[PDB]
Amino acid sequence: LEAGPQEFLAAGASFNQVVTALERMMTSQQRLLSDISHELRTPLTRLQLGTALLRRRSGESKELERIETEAQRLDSMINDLLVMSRNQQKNALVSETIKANQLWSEVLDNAAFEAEQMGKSLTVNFPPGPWPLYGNPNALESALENIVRNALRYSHTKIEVGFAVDKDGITITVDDDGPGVSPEDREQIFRPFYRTDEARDRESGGTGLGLAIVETAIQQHRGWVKAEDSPLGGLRLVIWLPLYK
C-alpha cells in the first residue's frame, strides 16, 4: 500500500492499481537500461581510440581485427537499445481500456502503404472490431507493427493479417510467403539480439530486438506470442490477448 511497493501491493488493491504499480517498476527498469546503454558508449569510444592508436603504432593484426569487430558489434547493439529506449520513453506507461479497431487500424493502414511501395501485397482477411482490451496502447501498437514490418521485409510477394474474437480474447495471425524459420529457431527468434544466420546475411534490419519487444509487451499484457509454419510458405506469428469486461 506503501511508497515504491511490489505488485504484491496486489494484496488488497484493485487490478488497475496493481498494473500501474507494475508500470512504476517498468519505467525505472527502462530508465536503468537506457542509463547503462548510454554509459557503455563512453568506455567504448575510448577503447576504440586505443585500437586506432595501436593500429597506428604496430599495424593490422588478426587479434586487433577481432577486438575492432567485437567493439563494433557492441556499438550497434547499444545503438538499437537506445533506439528502443527512446521510443519506450516519449510516452508515459499508462494502461487504459482501448478497443482493438482503434488500437491497430493505423498500424495496418500504414503497413498497406509500405507494402504498396515495396511492390508487395497486404491482405487483411478479417479486421479488428471494437473489442475491449486493457493495456498500454503504444506497447500493443509496437507489438503488431514489429511483426508486420518484419513480414514486409522477409516476404517474397504477399503478407496477410487476420483477426479473430471469442468470449475469452483476440487472436491476431500474421503470415508471409517468404522464407520461413526452421522449427529449431522458432523459440529463439524471441530472444534479444537473436537473428537467424540467414537474416544475418541479408543485412537490411536491426540487431534483433523486434520480437523481444513483442514477447515482452504481450506477456506484460497477459497474453502470448507464437511462431509457426505459415500456409503461405513463410512465417506465421500468432498473438493472443485477453478481453477486458
Place this chain on the structure above:
Amino acid sequence: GPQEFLAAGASFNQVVTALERMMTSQQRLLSDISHELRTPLTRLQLGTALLRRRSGESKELERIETEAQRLDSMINDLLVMSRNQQKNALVSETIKANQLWSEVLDNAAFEAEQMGKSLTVNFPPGPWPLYGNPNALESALENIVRNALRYSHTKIEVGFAVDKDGITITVDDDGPGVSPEDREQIFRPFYRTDEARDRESGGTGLGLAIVETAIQQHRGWVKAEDSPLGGLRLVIWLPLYK
C-alpha cells in the same frame, strides 16, 4: 472487494502463470540483454589476451583492457539491478571528491589529446566528503566534460571549489554556446538543439538528463550559463557530508 483479477474464463493455475510472466517480463529482458552484450565483450577480451601473448604489453593495449573492464562492470550492473529496482535507485556510500572524479578527468585529458583540443584543470578536487552513488556522480561529471570536448573549438577548462556547505564544479568551453532560451531545455531527455541536429544528423540526447537526475537525487543543482571562454558553462553544486 475492489476489482479483482481477470484475464479470461481461466483457471487459478493459468491466473498465476499469467501473473508471473507479466511481472517478470521486464527483468528477464534486461538479464537477457546483459548475457547477449557479455558474449562480444568476452570475445573482445580474449582478443586483447591473445594480442598481449603475441606482442606483449603496450600503453595502447592497457587502455583497451581497462576500457573493456569498465564495460564488463556496467554489463554486470544491468544484470544485478534488473531483478530489484525496489524503490528505484537506493544505494549510497561515503566517498572523497578526489577519488570519485580523478579517473574521469585523467580520461578526459586522453580524449582531449586525441581530439587535438586542450583540457586545463584550474583547480583539482581534494579529499572532500560526499555521500551518494559513486557511479551516478562519476557519470554526472563525465557527461559534462565529454560534452565540452565535443562542442568546444579548441579548449576546455574544469575548476573545483570547496566550502563548509559544498563543492562547486565549473566546466567551460570555447566552442559555440547555447541560446539563453535553450539553456533550460538542454537538460530534457532525448532533446538536442537544432544547431547540433545539423552538425550531426539526429542522435541521442540523454547526457544532461542523466546529469540533472543524478545531481538532484544527490541533493545538489546543475546550471547552464555563458562561459568566459565564449561557449557553454556548466556548473554543478553538490553538498558536503556530515
